[PDB]
Amino acid sequence: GPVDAPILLRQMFEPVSCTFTYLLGDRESREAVLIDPVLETAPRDAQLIKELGLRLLYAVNTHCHADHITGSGLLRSLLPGCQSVISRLSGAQADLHIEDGDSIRFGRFALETRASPGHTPGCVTFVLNDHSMAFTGDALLIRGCGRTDFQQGCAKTLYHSVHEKIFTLPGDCLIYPAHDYHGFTVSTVEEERTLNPRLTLSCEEFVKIMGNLNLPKPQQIDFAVPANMRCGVQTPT
Amino acid sequence: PVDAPILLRQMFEPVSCTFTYLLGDRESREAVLIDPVLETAPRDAQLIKELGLRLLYAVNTHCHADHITGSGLLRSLLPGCQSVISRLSGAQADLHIEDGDSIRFGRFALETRASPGHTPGCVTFVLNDHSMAFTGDALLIRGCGRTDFQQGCAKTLYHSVHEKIFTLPGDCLIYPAHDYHGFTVSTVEEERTLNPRLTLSCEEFVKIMGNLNLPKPQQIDFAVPANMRCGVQT
Ligand SMILES: [Fe+3]
Ligand SMILES: [Fe+3]
């Protein structure tokens, strides 16, 4: 029986791309926001929103993804009034564009935009005004981080992004990444800045490891990125 | 709200689609673990040490047919911790429980509510707060567990949920043991109103659950015997 109506938070999971989608909502004003929605599960998302009696104000992407197609464009039609949002530095199409310091207001809540490039130049982190939660996209993963060998990625930039924008948050602040490949669903700032095998290294040691992963080009990057630059629109049927 | 909030971590096992839940008291450093899987026990143990917790109980909601419990192996990796399962499951464990029993860890408590149906040994763990309920395969998100194996009974399942789960506060969270559609959490309010199966008449519910004509899970002939003996295979 806490005095204030707790924020509504629902974490969904797309098993193939291992992508996390996040639904945030004000329980009282029934306004909501959707972070990193996937195209294939867009109608599922929309169904839950209607079932919860919520109204979707924004469909937001932490960055231009290369592993799946965004559902933000589809949601504009499935939920009239909804607006697509993405960083200006992503260079990707959307109804609205944000940059560092921008605030996405929904109900009595707000997601504060902190630019955290590295994985891509357009990566941003969404911190709840409470500073109790942070949605880090692929900038910071649980016990890891996004690769920096593609999409004009820079390891040195990533290292500084996380240390200056995410690790500077309260230790108790939750970490909700855009992906997880090991069965986790959440972490904390305190955990990562203490235990993250990569980000606890020096910047030097970090850059040298990120360049030696020698991972392969993702399967969908050729079809995923362009579609996301156009807010999800791809050749039909 | 002066005492620290409960620690809660939801892990996911992709092939089995199983949810393992780590619950802990931040101030007491005492923890429990609900439905741990064998293939991810080392991972779970490592996380417990990283968080600086001491695992008291490795707990199972019921005797699983889809995977092998990590409760056995965790008794080795984290000495002092004990396996816990319902007496009615007929399964081997260090401790056995029944409706009404509390599993204490720090200032927190899991109220055991006997919720048979999917199996005779199914129980739902309700946080003393009444803000969370770990429902096993009794109540799934927008569904429920199959009732055609492990001596399951549909009429019992319907009653269990309606009497033990739907009686909880509407805003109480629902954390199932599985999900096959990308969800992680639900609420009592939602399932009470939206669960396509359990919102039906009991009589209707008993009918359709038998009509599914699904194939028995592949892992059952190996999971259940191993889980009846705390993870020991063959
Ligand atoms: Fe990415
Ligand atoms: Fe089961």
Residue numbers in the entry:
A (entry chain B): 17 to 253
B (entry chain A): 18 to 251
Sentences from the paper on this structure:
Recombinant hETHE1 lacking its 20 residue N-terminal mitochondrial targeting sequence was produced in Escherichia coli and highly purified (≥95%) as determined by sodium dodecyl sulfate-polyacrylamide gel electrophoresis (SDS-PAGE) analysis. hETHE1 was crystallized using the sitting drop vapour diffusion method. The final model (orthorhombic space group P212121) has two chains representing the dimer in the asymmetric unit. The hETHE1 structure reveals an αββα MBL-type fold with two central mixed β-sheets, each containing six strands, surrounded on both sides by helices. Non-denaturing mass spectrometric and multi-angle laser light scattering (MALS) analyses indicate that hETHE1 is predominantly dimeric with some monomer also being observed (dimer to monomer ratio ∼10:1); quantitative gel filtration analysis indicated a mass for hETHE1 intermediate between monomeric (26 116 Da) and dimeric (52 232 Da) forms in solution. The total buried surface area at the interface is 1950 Å2 and the calculated free energy of binding (ΔG) for the dimer is about −37 kcal/mol. Three water molecules complete the metal coordination. Residues His81ETHE1 (His118BBL), Asp83ETHE1 (Asp120BBL) and His195ETHE1 (His263BBL) are present in the hETHE1 active site, but are not involved in metal coordination as observed in the current structural data. Analysis of the enzyme surface reveals a channel, comprised of residues 163–166 and 226–232, leading to the active site that is sufficient to accommodate a substrate molecule of GSSH; this channel is apparently conserved in the A. thaliana ETHE1.
EE is caused by mutations to the gene (HGNC: 23287) encoding for the ethylmalonic encephalopathy protein 1 (ETHE1, also known as sulphur dioxygenase, SDO) and correlates with increased cellular levels of hydrogen sulfide. (1)]. ETHE1 is reported to be localized to mitochondria where its activity is linked to electron transfer chain energy generation and is of central importance in hydrogen sulfide metabolism. Sequence analyses predict that hETHE1 is a member of the widely distributed metallo-β-lactamase (MBL)-fold family.
